[PDB]
Amino acid sequence: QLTREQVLELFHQRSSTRYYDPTKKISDEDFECILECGRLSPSSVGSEPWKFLVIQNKTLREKMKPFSWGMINQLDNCSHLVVILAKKNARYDSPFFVDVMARKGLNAEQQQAALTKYKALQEEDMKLLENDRTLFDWCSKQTYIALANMLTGASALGIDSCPIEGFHYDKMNECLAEEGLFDPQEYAVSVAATFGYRSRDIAKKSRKGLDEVVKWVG
Amino acid sequence: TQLTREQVLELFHQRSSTRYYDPTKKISDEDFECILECGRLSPSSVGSEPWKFLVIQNKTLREKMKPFSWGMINQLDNCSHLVVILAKKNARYDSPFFVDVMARKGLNAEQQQAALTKYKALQEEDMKLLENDRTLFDWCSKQTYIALANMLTGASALGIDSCPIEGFHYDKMNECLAEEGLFDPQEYAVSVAATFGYRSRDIAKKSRKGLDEVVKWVG
Ligand SMILES: Cc1cc2nc3c(=O)[nH]c(=O)nc-3n(C[C@H](O)[C@H](O)[C@H](O)COP(=O)(O)O)c2cc1C
Ligand SMILES: Cc1cc2nc3c(=O)[nH]c(=O)nc-3n(C[C@H](O)[C@H](O)[C@H](O)COP(=O)(O)O)c2cc1C
Ligand SMILES: [Cl-]
Ligand SMILES: [Cl-]
Ligand SMILES: [Cl-]
């Protein structure tokens, strides 16, 4: 439990860190807790379509620099780097969704019902089976939930972070797949995040005002 | 604001998706503004904040949604607050939308030209978002899922229950909300929703994949 003022200050204190102290490393305990915040995240129909690559290998980090302009300095100095993958071809009738149902412990009639629920959602409600990319982006949207909670959970632990889109996705995919780090038919890169301890004061928040981003329908 | 690893874990564990709300309990105006603030303060790619939070308290409007909102059809009645998050359509690097983005960063003329080439690279080449309208909308949509997550977590921290909602016909929803004059359908479309309030059944146990299945370590 937190007060209103603390809840606010938690989201004011979290800022995108572009300069890490290279003399400070996150403890294994603290980082596993950050990862737990991602794994515990909610996801459409319990799909959990994420995978978290923790890239600590200096050599691999250096390989990413030339195509990762968004984090080119952070690559060198951050404690931890997480590249989040999202599941490809996450169709209602896929072995992937066979597992989803197995985790939910559904019997045979419930599974035919769940499947008709997933079919209408993908095909008609959200029109996700348009092409390969729309279905992938649906899973990727769920991984942005994990991303957000990892940033928030880290900040609560006193750990700074930066979410990262600033890299060439085709090359990053090829780089990690060539390392044998995932099956390029099953997964692709969604988004990444650095973690560590900042070296500079937090810059104050610049957002649109509440009255511009909220519309009340009474 | 600081928490032990024990409390952080409990924070993300205590947050569950509630399907059954108690219609007696209503969130205070102070608490719910706090929840909204969690979305508004969320990070977003190049600071684009491409969301809009529609707060649907109108009881008549909530019923009109039920016939195509199977994911929340019971919840529409009993939940305290309902949020439909919109994402910006066609948030191209060269759009008026990105004129505002740059002004909020206080960029000068030289800084704006450099930023514009950075956005163009990001959208056109690094992320390949400009192939069509839907890929570019979906990118903004992804950023709104960050505001979604943080509103759930902030709600949880205040003792307030939530449920994220994709279970509705998007076309019918976009149409319904746009006909009610709630947004410009050329400028925004529905991205995701979320109900807020207090639960009426017990919190359920979490079924997640193992940490060993979802984490791959590269040391
Ligand atoms: C998905 C996404 C990707 C981002 N990619 C980058 C990036 O690659 N490099 C960078 O320095 N910041 C990046 N940012 C951080 C944003 O620029 C930042 O969140 C925004 O300016 C608001 O500032 P704040 O996070 O300090 O509140 C990204 C943010 C998000 C959520
Ligand atoms: C984007 C999103 C959409 C969801 N859509 C629905 C929905 O339509 N109806 C619903 O009751 N739950 C919905 N869920 C809830 C998930 O099924 C639920 O989060 C998951 O099974 C994990 O349980 P937990 O959130 O209680 O940990 C959605 C979740 C998310 C993140
Ligand atoms: Cl950087
Ligand atoms: Cl400092
Ligand atoms: Cl509008």
Side-chain angles (χ1 to χ4, degrees):
Chain A
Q1 296 281 59
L2 290 177
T3 66
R4 284 197 301 269
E5 298 82 24
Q6 284 165 353
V7 165
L8 292 186
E9 208 266 314
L10 169 59
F11 288 92
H12 268 283
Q13 69 185 39
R14 183 230 48 88
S15 63
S16 304
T17 307
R18 277 69 170 234
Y19 299 100
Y20 293 102
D21 192 330
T23 70
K24 290 180 171 160
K25 308 298 192 181
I26 301 164
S27 72
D28 296 332
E29 292 83 3
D30 274 350
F31 193 65
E32 175 199 348
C33 181
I34 294 173
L35 293 166
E36 288 280 32
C37 297
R39 177 186 82 95
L40 297 194
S41 285
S43 66
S44 191
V45 294
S47 55
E48 309 173 43
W50 42 61
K51 194 178 279 295
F52 310 114
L53 300 188
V54 190
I55 312 291
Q56 303 302 91
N57 183 279
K58 290 321 285 160
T59 299
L60 180 51
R61 277 180 190 198
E62 177 90 345
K63 202 178 300 132
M64 300 169 183
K65 283 172 118 183
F67 52 86
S68 292
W69 55 270
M71 60 177 166
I72 177 162
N73 181 255
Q74 301 179 38
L75 245 0
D76 286 339
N77 298 315
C78 71
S79 186
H80 287 71
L81 157 74
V82 174
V83 183
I84 304 166
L85 314 178
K87 184 81 190 67
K88 284 167 78 148
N89 198 45
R91 281 178 54 101
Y92 63 100
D93 56 8
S94 66
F96 179 81
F97 261 93
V98 174
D99 268 324
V100 178
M101 296 186 296
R103 288 199 302 281
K104 296 198 179 300
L106 323 181
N107 57 46
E109 187 115 30
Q110 296 171 315
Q111 287 172 38
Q112 281 323 124
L115 284 165
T116 55
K117 173 178 145 174
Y118 306 154
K119 177 178 166 57
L121 185 74
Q122 296 195 325
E123 225 195 303
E124 185 64 31
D125 292 321
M126 298 180 81
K127 284 174 181 51
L128 296 182
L129 312 187
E130 199 191 291
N131 56 69
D132 293 347
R133 185 164 188 180
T134 66
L135 186 64
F136 167 85
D137 278 337
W138 172 65
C139 292
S140 168
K141 293 174 189 198
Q142 320 298 326
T143 71
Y144 277 65
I145 303 190
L147 171 72
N149 290 331
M150 287 191 282
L151 304 187
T152 302
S155 162
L157 289 174
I159 293 162
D160 303 302
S161 61
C162 192
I164 301 286
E165 276 179 6
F167 58 85
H168 195 278
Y169 270 69
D170 280 349
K171 290 184 191 168
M172 176 77 73
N173 271 307
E174 295 171 23
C175 172
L176 294 163
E178 283 176 21
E179 290 287 332
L181 289 175
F182 65 88
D183 188 333
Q185 270 72 247
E186 295 297 326
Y187 286 93
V189 175
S190 179
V191 60
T194 64
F195 303 83
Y197 295 93
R198 67 188 149 71
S199 59
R200 320 195 170 182
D201 297 358
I202 294 129
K204 63 98 209 172
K205 285 274 174 275
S206 170
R207 295 292 190 284
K208 289 179 297 202
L210 206 62
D211 39 297
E212 173 160 8
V213 297
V214 183
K215 178 172 209 98
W216 211 271
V217 189
Chain B
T1 293
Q2 279 200 323
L3 300 166
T4 61
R5 303 192 259 99
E6 179 172 350
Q7 295 162 309
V8 169
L9 211 63
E10 181 64 19
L11 184 59
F12 287 97
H13 226 97
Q14 71 192 21
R15 198 271 337 148
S16 291
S17 290
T18 58
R19 279 71 195 234
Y20 294 108
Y21 286 101
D22 175 292
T24 280
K25 291 312 293 169
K26 304 273 137 273
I27 300 163
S28 73
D29 298 2
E30 310 86 89
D31 291 336
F32 192 71
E33 177 165 336
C34 191
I35 295 166
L36 290 170
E37 207 92 324
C38 298
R40 172 204 162 245
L41 291 174
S42 287
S44 60
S45 185
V46 298
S48 59
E49 315 168 40
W51 40 67
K52 200 175 269 299
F53 308 128
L54 303 189
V55 180
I56 310 297
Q57 301 301 93
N58 176 282
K59 277 173 159 54
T60 306
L61 188 49
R62 290 194 185 175
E63 237 117 45
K64 191 151 122 46
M65 295 171 174
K66 284 170 89 174
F68 52 88
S69 296
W70 56 266
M72 52 170 175
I73 186 155
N74 148 276
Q75 311 178 213
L76 251 345
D77 291 326
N78 301 315
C79 80
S80 175
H81 291 67
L82 167 68
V83 182
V84 182
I85 302 164
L86 310 183
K88 188 70 187 65
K89 293 176 70 182
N90 186 64
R92 291 177 52 85
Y93 65 93
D94 56 6
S95 70
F97 179 78
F98 261 92
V99 171
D100 286 299
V101 165
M102 295 193 292
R104 294 199 304 279
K105 304 172 190 183
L107 305 192
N108 61 29
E110 203 166 82
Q111 279 151 16
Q112 281 163 46
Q113 282 314 308
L116 281 171
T117 80
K118 172 178 90 165
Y119 305 144
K120 171 181 164 78
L122 181 70
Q123 293 189 331
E124 212 174 25
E125 182 63 54
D126 292 327
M127 304 189 70
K128 297 186 163 59
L129 306 178
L130 301 189
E131 312 280 337
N132 58 51
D133 296 339
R134 185 171 184 174
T135 61
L136 176 59
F137 168 80
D138 274 344
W139 171 68
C140 295
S141 184
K142 284 166 183 194
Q143 323 301 318
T144 71
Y145 275 61
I146 300 177
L148 171 68
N150 291 329
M151 282 185 289
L152 310 178
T153 301
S156 179
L158 301 174
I160 299 177
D161 297 291
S162 49
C163 193
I165 295 302
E166 273 172 11
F168 55 91
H169 195 277
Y170 273 67
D171 281 355
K172 281 178 196 162
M173 181 72 70
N174 277 304
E175 173 120 296
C176 171
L177 301 194
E179 295 189 336
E180 294 276 342
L182 303 185
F183 67 90
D184 192 334
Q186 286 175 30
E187 299 286 343
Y188 283 87
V190 170
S191 174
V192 64
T195 58
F196 298 95
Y198 302 85
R199 58 199 166 79
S200 84
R201 304 192 181 180
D202 262 339
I203 268 183
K205 224 154 213 274
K206 308 202 99 62
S207 188
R208 292 297 188 277
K209 276 175 299 205
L211 198 58
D212 293 322
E213 289 168 336
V214 69
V215 173
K216 177 136 182 80
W217 205 279
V218 193

